[PDB]
Every structure is written in C-alpha cells, then in structure tokens.
C-alpha cells in the first residue's frame with residue numbers, strides 16, 4: 193500500500209521552507225525512516241528539523257510513543273501528548289484511511305503530515321533547507337541532475353527485490369511465496385556484489401541516495417533479516433565481500449550512518465513480531481552487529 | 486529413556502543377525518548417532534533400519550505411508566502408523582515418551598533399548614561375531630580412552646547436545662541466554678581442542694566425535710536460525726570445528742550416507758510453536774561446505 197501524504201516544502205507552496213517548523217517522527221528499527229535520519233545528519237539539518245523517536249515495540253494500535261511503551265532512546269511525543277503514531281495522522285485528517293506508517297515529516301504550524309514517503313522526504317532534504325545551512329552542507333546533493341537517471345535505474349530493482357524483497361520473504365506465509373521472494377533477493381545481492389567490486393559507491397563514485405537506500409536494508413541484514421526473515425542463503429559478512437566493504441566504509445567512516453543505527457531498536461522490533469516469532473526471544477547474535485574495518 | 490537393556494551372550498537378548506531393528510528419524514541427532522555407528526561397524530545387513538517421516542505429528546513420529554516424505558518408509562513388520570504403536574505393542578501400559586531411536590527385537594516384539602548413548606555402545610562389540618575382521622576390530626569406546634571420552638562427553642552432552650535445545654525451546658529471554666552462552670563457550674573450548682587435530686580424543690575416531698558430530702552437522706543448517714544459536718556460525722566462526730566436521734562428513738561415508746539435510750530442516754521448521762509460518766528457509770547454501 194502506497195503512502196498517501198505526498199507534499200513538498202517549496203517556496204510559495206503550501207509548506208514554505210522554514211527553520212524550526214518541520215519535524216520527523218520515526219522508529220529507529222524502520223529502514224525507510226532511517227533513510228530520513230541518515231540524510232538529516234548528512235545535510236546538517238539537526239537544528240532545523242526536529243526528530244522524535246517512537247518505541248520500536250509495535251503494538252496493537254501501531255507505533256507507540258516512549259511513554260506508552262518504554263525502551264531506551266524512545267521518546268514521548270513533545271507536542272500533542274500523542275500516544276501512538278495514528279494519533280498524528282488522525283490529528284492531520286480525522287477521516288484518514290491509510291496506514292499509520294513511519295517516517296512522518298510533520299508540519300507543526302498547520303499540524304498535518306507533509307509527506308510520509310521516505311523516498312521523497314530525503315529528496316526534500318537535498319535542497320529545501322539549503323538557505324539555512326553552511327556552504328559545505330548546502331552543497332551536498334544526493335540526487336544530482338547528472339546522476340538522476342542512473343540512480344533511478346538502480347533504485348528500481350534495489351527497491352523491488354532488496355528493500356521490499358526482505359519483507360516479501362520474511363512476511364511470506366507459504367513456502368512458494370517465500371522462495372519466490374528470497375531467490376530474486378539473493379540474485380540482486382549477487383548483482384550488487386559485482387557492481388560494488390572495487391568501488392566505494394553504487395553510482396558516480398560519490399555518495400548518493402542509492403547508497404542510503406541500500407544501506408538501511410544491508411545494515412539490518414545479518415543482525416535480523418538472515419534469521420527472522422529467513423534471508424539466509426548467505427550472510428553479508430561471509431558471503432558478499434564487496435558489499436561488506438562498502439557497508440563498513442559507510443558505517444564506520446560516516447557518522448550519519450552509525451549514529452542513526454540502533455541495533456537494539458532494530459533487533460527488538462523484528463523479534464517482537466509475534467506472528468513470526470511467537471516466543472518473542474531476541475537472539476544474542478550475531479556478534480558483532482557489524483564487523484570493524 | 487526407560488528401556489535400557491543390552492544384547493549379550495546368555496542374556497535376555499542374544500546377539501543374532503536379522504533379529505534386531507532400528508527405528509529412527511533422519512532429523513533426530515540422537516537417532517542419527519545410531520545410524521552413523523551402524524555404518525561405521527558394517528552392521529547394515531545384521532541390524533535392520535526403518536526411517537520414519539520427519540514430519541512430527543500430534544501422534545508423534547509417523548511412518549512414511551502415513552506422512553510421506555522422500556526417504557521415509559512404511560513400517561515393515563506391524564503396519565504401525567506411528568512410533569507409539571511399537572511402544573504399545575511392547576508394553577500396552579507404557580507411560581514414557583515415544584522417542585526415536587528404538588532398538589527393537591523382532592523376536593520378542595519389545596524395545597531392547599531406546600537410549601542412543603547405549604545403543605551405540607552395544608554396537609561396538611555385541612555383533613562382532615558376524616563381522617569381517619576390520620569392522621569387528623573397530624571400537625569407539627575403548628578402555629584406554631574411556632575416562633577421557635567420558636570427561637568430554639559430560640559437558641558436550643549438557644551444554645552442546647542438549648544446549649541447542651535448551652536455547653531453541655526457551656520461552657523467556659533469561660532462559661535462552663542462560664543456555665546459548667554456555668553453548669558457545671563450549672564451542673570455544675572445543676575449537677581449542679580440535680585445533681590441529683582430526684579427532685577429539687586419542688587421535689582416533691571415538692564415540693565422542695560421533696556424539697558431537699550429530700549436533701554440529703545440524704548447526705548452520707537449522708540451529709543457528711531456528712534455535713537462535715547465532716552468536717556465530719560453524720563455517721565462519723569456528724575453523725577448527727569446521728575442518729573436523731568436514732573431514733568426518735566428506736572422508737567417512739558413514740557420516741554422509743546418514744545425513745539427510747532435507748529431513749533435518751523439514752523436522753525443525755515444521756515446529757509450529759517456534760516457527761508458526763512453517764516456512765523452511767532455502768539457506769544456508771550449502772548445507773556443508775566442501776573440503
């Protein structure tokens with residue numbers, strides 16, 4: 193089901209570019225939301241766009257805030273005493289009938305959802321706030337014109353077979369559906385492994401959003417997807433050395449990627465999914481969550 | 486286990502060819518012990534075997550005609566539908582568990598022994614009169630090594646053979662962690678023992694290797710994922726264990742001919758209480774890496 197709040201932050205538009213007006217609601221466990229946290233740090237937007245961390249322990253009413261479901265690092269809603277993320281959506285639109293997903297890019301002025309599509313939120317962040325940033329941060333652009341077509345091409349099959357692929361495998365309820373998802377997933381990892389052989393970045397020998405969008409899946413792979421989602425033909429760390437190297441360089445050499453990566457949130461969210469893991473036990477491995485360089 | 490008799494000249498169960506029969510599941514590591522030793526000792530035409538379905542049911546282990554699965558067999562002797570039918574033929578008032586392995590006596594129609602650690606010891610000597618000289622000479626629990634074998638078996642049994650189950654069937658975070666940490670500590674200890682060695686004890690194959698093997702061969706294919714025994718894998722975390730394991734599997738056909746990874750994975754991942762989706766993962770690929 194596609195996200196249905198698809199607005200932008202544009203001069204003269206509904207959502208004028210401003211400092212201290214827009215706010216992200218996210219779960220650290222969610223790769224889609226983590227995309228927006230990574231790009232928020234890359235672009236130096238921490239004092240321009242606020243963030244609230246919901247509890248990673250998904251509930252019968254959806255994402256709870258940290259007062260409802262305490263967890264280290266999870267926060268109460270600062271603004272409306274919202275108890276679950278759905279309260280934000282119903283505040284924005286009492287008749288809303290979509291899903292109550294994170295990430296939420298929220299407008300505090302008009303009290304509505306600007307955009308709840310991670311792929312668009314991170315593109316908003318490329319330019320919408322540049323006037324509020326120092327020159328070096330303003331210049332960063334993870335979706336530049338010259339590389340857009342190439343980025344779109346690799347994004348298309350990474351999204352379908354890898355970003356969504358792990359879920360297609362993990363949430364499959366038949367053997368047939370599981371196999372139909374996990375095989376194209378690992379074929380695409382085989383392909384990414386070739387593309388990344390001898391390279392630090394997927395596109396253009398520079399960091400782009402294609403890297404960000406892949407990273408949020410791959411960083412969760414050995415710690416959660418291999419076991420919980422049965423994506424276990426091989427691991428990243430032992431089966432895919434070019435991807436493994438690319439992953440570790442992003443994580444260990446760029447604080448935007450490590451400081452937004454909370455492996456305890458990640459593992460707690462996935463392994464609390466009772467329909468898949470009814471014992472609710474969280475495995476202690478793999479050790480470590482990500483190997484050093 | 487409560488049938489604990491032996492096969493001895495002059496005893497209740499005389500050593501004979503064609504009289505005793507094993508009922509086993511390929512998925513069960515305890516039962517696989519008896520299959521491995523059966524082949525090591527060349528007993529295939531002396532002690533029969535029937536393979537039950539790995540698809541454990543509400544009535545226990547079914548036979549292959551009840552719950553078909555490649556390689557699972559019908560009961561040849563009593564049209565048994567489930568393993569419990571053998572136990573109840575032996576003792577209608579039996580109140581124990583209907584476990585495999587079963588070492589069965591076709592003559593008196595009873596369970597001689599349903600304890601794997603004793604079945605494989607019976608196999609060291611009880612049938613030697615029926616064997617060629619080279620098979621007869623094999624003894625996997627020899628007097629000179631017994632004390633050392635017993636020492637390693639004690640903690641392998643407690644923390645590794647049983648440990649994977651203590652971890653996988655724990656229902657609290659606390660109990661899982663209490664089981665999985667000693668499991669991997671004991672793997673660390675075994676890794677040191679096996680560095681530069683082909684065998685755990687005495688530079689020769691013993692029952693200690695067999696009893697460890699049945700757990701380790703199931704480790705990357707099932708225990709890591711299904712039982713959350715995932716601090717590290719054998720193949721990438723434990724090179725000395727991995728080498729020992731691969732030499733046994735690839736160089737001694739008793740260990741490969743009796744290793745059915747499809748049965749192994751089907752049994753574990755059909756356990757609804759742990760894996761309600763019932764999906765069987767396609768990995769790891771391969772089940773065991775080559776030498």
Ligand SMILES: N[C@@H](CCC(=O)N[C@@H](CS)C(=O)NCC(=O)O)C(=O)O
Pocket residue numbers: 194195221222223224225254291292293294295308309310311
């Ligand atoms: N297409 C959205 C997907 C966001 C999404 O699916 N988030 C999940 C968490 S990983 C969520 O909030 N699920 C709650 C639900 O679907 O009810 C995006 O990329 O931002």
Ligand SMILES: N[C@@H](CCC(=O)N[C@@H](CS)C(=O)NCC(=O)O)C(=O)O
Pocket residue numbers: 486512513514515516545582583584585586599600601602
């Ligand atoms: N102590 C016995 C254990 C045998 C055992 O537990 N077998 C399991 C399969 S791995 C079984 O048959 N479980 C059926 C049950 O408990 O009902 C031995 O080592 O032979």
